Design a protein around this ligand. Structure first.
Ligand SMILES: Cc1cccc(C)c1OC[C@@H](C)N
Length: 247
């Protein structure tokens, strides 16, 4: 996250921290994720596509710090790693950038809701906030483009939803942004998601309810003028989510 504020998991209790283990025993952070039910985390395909082996992954819930333990945190393995069959990446644009991780504790259980671990609601078919709406993003992503390490503490910020019409302007992304994507940015270009924020939630308060409107997907640089964050439009993927979580 560029700009914004440090935060704690209690304010973002659906946030999942996803790591990958390496031969040698080193674990690195991979991407964000959102808990949409006790057994299911949703994230972004591009996070996993080069390493589609579920055994490599570790998911934490209730975690506020990157490399240390948070009271109440819970650790999960991945029982099923589901990538979107039609995922693809162009120079900038990532398509069908959405994934599902079925989680389970070492004892075989799914998540136990608590003060710091909660599900986030999905949106309803093609019902997204209007452009100009303020929404929040959360992640352990870079604080500056020149950074090579991630912040130790979870961050959040607030960005505004940008219309498809504006986002498809030639100085923005032209036709590379599709209707299955959502653009969001700061009107002054001072705050944004960045590398390492992928897979994490774009949350909008919709009809009184906190809704998972987007998933951090792609963009050109971070907090660049005329270059919004691009998000998977969750509301266009409800039949895919339902079909894969129904089992
Ligand atoms: C999400 C992401 C992943 C890799 C690279 C960049 C610049 C990224 O940020 C683009 C945009 C969200 N600011």
């Amino acid at each position: 996250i560029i700009g914004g504020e440090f935060t704690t998991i209690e304010n973002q209790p659906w946030f999942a921290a996803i790591y990958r283990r390496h031969r040698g025993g080193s674990v690195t952070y991979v991407c964000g994720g959102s808990l949409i039910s006790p057994c299911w985390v949703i994230s972004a395909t591009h996070c996993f596509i080069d390493y589609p082996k579920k055994e490599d992954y570790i998911v934490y819930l209730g975690r506020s710090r990157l490399n240390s333990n948070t009271q109440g945190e819970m650790k999960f393995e991945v029982e099923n790693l589901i990538l979107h069959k039609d995922y693809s990446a162009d120079t900038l644009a990532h398509h069908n950038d959405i994934a599902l991780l079925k989680i389970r504790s070492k004892e075989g259980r799914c998540a136990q809701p608590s003060r710091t671990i909660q599900t986030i609601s999905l949106p309803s078919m093609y019902n997204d906030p209007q452009f100009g709406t303020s929404c929040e993003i959360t992640g352990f992503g870079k604080e500056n483009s020149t950074d090579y390490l991630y912040p130790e503490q979870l961050k959040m910020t607030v960005v505004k939803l940008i219309s498809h019409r504006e986002c498809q302007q030639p100085h923005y992304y032209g036709s590379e942004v599709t209707t299955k994507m959502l653009c969001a940015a700061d009107p002054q270009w001072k705050t944004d998601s960045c590398q390492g924020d992928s897979g994490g939630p774009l949350v909008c308060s919709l009809q009184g309810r906190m809704t998972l409107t987007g998933i951090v997907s792609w963009g050109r640089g971070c907090a660049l003028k005329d270059k919004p964050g691009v998000y998977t439009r969750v509301s266009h993927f409800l039949p895919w989510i339902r079909s894969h979580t129904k089992e």
